[PDB]
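Help needed: design a sequence for this.
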């Protein structure tokens, strides 16, 4: 697969071509590097509504690599931020450093 491509998390190209046409839904997508080996680690996605304030929301049950994350209900802030994190299956304690994701403008409604 070309370069190694690390575990970076980016958003999804939404707009006038989002399959159906949700009035307020987001789409994410990330992927690690190399074909790794085994697994059983766990990856959660973080996303807070960048605005006057915020409480930062998290999400579990996320796979180390998502094809087309699908969120909905982010109506509250003008700009939304999102990060990524991973750890182990039965031996947590570090959770690694909250990898830096990115920030953009989700649905306008």
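Sure. Designed sequence:
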């Amino acid at each position: 697969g070309s370069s190694l491509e690390p575990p970076m998390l980016q958003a999804l190209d939404i707009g006038p071509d989002v399959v159906s046409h949700q009035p307020g839904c987001l789409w994410l997508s990330w992927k690690p590097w190399k074909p790794s080996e085994y697994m059983e680690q766990e990856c959660e996605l973080r996303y807070q509504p960048q605005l006057k304030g915020a409480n930062w929301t998290l999400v579990f049950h996320l796979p180390s690599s998502k094809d087309q994350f699908e969120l909905c209900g982010l109506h509250q802030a003008p700009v939304y931020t999102l990060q990524m994190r991973c750890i182990r299956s039965s031996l947590p304690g570090f959770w690694s450093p909250w990898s830096p994701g990115l920030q953009l403008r989700p649905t306008m409604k």
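The chain has one domain: 1-109.
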